[PDB]
Structures are given as structure tokens and as C-alpha cells.
């Protein structure tokens, strides 16, 4: 119901609605995140995966990576929300998509040039393959489809330790405004519909990995409107408030501001067609 939106919008009820969702949210444990050795594997000390839903790097010396599995059986939807990899976590990143049989990764942030800020370019921008010998992987850019508000990179992920090959689709939404939320969910909605078109979100493949810089704001927005757009078209009586509360059990802080909350509504409404 959009009347819910118009009602919330009139009475200026966004800061309060969001502020509530913050109180109802429960805090689970995240000790592994805090281990000294895992300190430099986190971009933000304040954003950590819950020990009960965190993704484990299997058979690794250290099995920690700041990523969370988000299960929503009620929609046959499942994703891995993570942080944009750091210069020292790129091979962990790829090791992870491999072990999870991930078919697609959607990136919602821009790679910044500053480089005083980490933000590692983890996939190739030309015909030169990135090699990660520590975990035994190779990544090669097959082709890139550069649209207006996004870009899709076709990547070949090869396990050098066995010759096994897979092709991953890297969807990069490039127009989220620095600071603030988009004024219209048009370009964002199409991007969502394009990754759906690839069929990478179906329960057939492994969980798609979604990420922005921290993996809770933009990443949360994408997940929420995707799950909600599946709860509709199917069952009904969608309570965005609770659905977002059930997602916050797998990973903390999804939706960081009332604007992102409000934007999610707008997207779910317009996208509901």
C-alpha cells in the first residue's frame, strides 16, 4: 500500500518510524569480528558480521571475512552482504565467491581514486588477468557492457589449482549520488531488474554477493526492495518494517538513514509494476 507512504510522508513520520526500527533491532554476538588478528580485515570497526550468520572461508588458516549470509526462505531469496574488499582481503573475497558458487556480485559504490582510502580495484579493467596466488585464483575480464547508469563486467574466475572455470557477472551501479539518496528510483529499479534478468538471484545458484563500502546502507536498500518485490507478486500483506527487522538479524545496521528507508518505499512502490 502506497497510502502508507503518503500517510507517513504527510505527518513527517520517517525519523520516528526509522528510530523505532533501531530500538526493536536485537544485538547478537560478533566476537570473531573483534579478534585482534581480524582487526585489519574490517574496513570499519563499527560494522561487523554476527558470529551466527557470518560467511566462513573454508579450510583457511583464518576463516574470517566481514560478510553475512542473509536468508529469507519466505522469498526463496538469499544473499551475502559484504564490505568492498580491502587491499589485503581481495583474495579472501574471491575465495569466498568461489566456495559459495556465487554467479553474480553487485557493486553499489564507486571506486575512488584518492587511495588514501583503501578501496582496492579487485577485478581487471583490461586484458590483463589479476592473479591471487595466496588462494590460488585468477580473474580475467571477458567483456564489459557500459550503459548509462551502470556497467556489467563479464568475468572468468579460474581456480588455478585445478583448471576449473566459472563466469561471474559483475553488476556495477555507478550513479548513486555521493551523499544523500537518489531523487528518483528509476535508474536504480532498472538496474535491479537487469540483475534479475540474468537469473543470478534464483535459489539455483549460490548467494549473490552485494556490497557497497560498509555493506549495510546501499546494500541493505537493494536487498530490502528485492525481497519485498518478491513477497509481493507472490503472497501479500507486506510489512516493510518487520521484513527489514528480520534482515537485521543476519547483518546489523541495514538502512542507515530515514532517507534510505523512504527511498526503499518509493522503489518498492514504483517497482511494484
Just list the catalytic residues: 212
What is the full DSSP assignment across 203-272? TTSPPEEEEESSSSSHHHHHHHHHHHHHHSSSS----HHHHHHHHTTTBTT-S-SHHHHHHHHHHHHHH-
Find out whether 214 is annotated in a ligand binding site: yes
Find out whether 72 is annotated in a ligand binding site: no
| Four-residue CA torsion sign, 85, 102, 79, 231 | positive
Find out whether 217 is annotated in a ligand binding site: yes
Residues 6 or more apart in contact with residue 109 via CB below 8 angstroms: 84, 176, 211, 212, 213, 218
Find out whether 186 is annotated in a ligand binding site: no
Find out whether 178 is annotated in a ligand binding site: yes
Q: H or E element: which one contains 104?
A: strand 104-107
Find out whether 200 is annotated in a ligand binding site: no
Give the residue among 113, 84, 80 at the shortest CA–CA distance from 98: 80
Long-range contacts (CB closer than 8 Å, 24 or more residues apart) made by 71-76:
71/250, 72/227, 72/246, 72/247, 74/231, 74/235, 75/227, 75/230, 75/231, 75/234, 76/202, 76/203, 76/230
Find out whether 218 is annotated in a ligand binding site: yes
Residues 6 or more apart in contact with residue 236 via CB below 8 angstroms: none
Find out whether 248 is annotated in a ligand binding site: no
Check if the beta carbon of residue 199 is closer than 8 Å to that of residue 76.
no
Find out whether 215 is annotated in a ligand binding site: yes
* Cα–Cα dist 65/53, whole Å: 12
Binding site, annotated residues for substrate: 178, 212-218, 256
Binding site, annotated residues: 178, 212-218, 256
Amino acid at each position: 500500500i502506497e497510502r502508507e507512504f503518503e500517510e507517513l510522508d504527510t505527518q513527517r513520520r520517517w525519523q520516528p518510524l526509522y528510530l523505532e526500527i533501531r530500538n526493536e533491532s536485537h544485538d547478537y554476538p560478533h566476537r570473531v569480528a573483534k579478534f585482534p588478528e581480524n582487526r585489519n580485515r574490517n574496513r570499519y570497526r563499527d560494522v561487523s558480521p554476527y558470529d551466527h550468520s557470518r560467511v566462513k572461508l573454508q579450510n583457511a588458516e583464518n576463516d574470517y571475512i566481514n560478510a553475512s549470509l542473509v536468508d529469507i526462505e519466505e522469498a526463496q531469496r538469499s544473499y551475502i552482504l559484504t564490505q568492498g574488499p580491502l587491499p589485503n582481503t581481495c583474495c579472501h573475497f574471491w575465495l569466498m565467491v568461489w566456495q559459495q558458487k556465487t554467479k553474480a556480485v553487485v557493486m553499489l559504490n564507486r571506486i575512488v581514486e584518492k587511495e588514501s582510502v583503501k578501496c582496492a580495484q579487485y577485478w581487471p579493467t583490461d586484458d590483463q588477468e589479476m592473479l591471487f596466488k595466496e588462494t590460488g585464483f585468477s580473474v580475467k575480464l571477458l567483456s564489459e557492457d557500459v550503459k548509462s547508469y551502470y556497467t556489467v563486467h563479464l568475468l572468468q574466475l579460474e581456480n588455478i589449482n585445478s583448471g576449473e572455470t566459472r563466469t561471474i557477472s559483475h553488476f556495477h551501479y555507478t550513479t548513486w549520488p555521493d551523499f544523500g539518496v537518489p531523487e528518483s528510483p528509476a535508474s536504480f529499479l532498472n538496474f535491479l531488474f537487469k540483475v534479475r534478468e540474468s537469473g543470478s538471484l534464483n535459489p539455483d545458484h549460490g548467494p549473490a554477493v552485494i556490497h557497497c563500502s560498509a555493506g549495510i546502507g546501499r546494500s541493505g536498500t537493494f536487498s530490502l526492495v528485492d525481497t519485498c518485490l518478491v513477497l509481493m507478486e507472490k503472497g501479500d500483506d507486506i510489512n516493510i518494517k518487520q521484513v527489514l527487522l528480520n534482515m537485521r538479524k543476519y547483518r546489523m545496521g541495514l538502512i542507515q538513514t530515514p532517507d534510505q528507508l523512504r527511498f526503499s518505499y518509493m522503489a518498492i512502490i514504483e517497482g511494484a509494476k
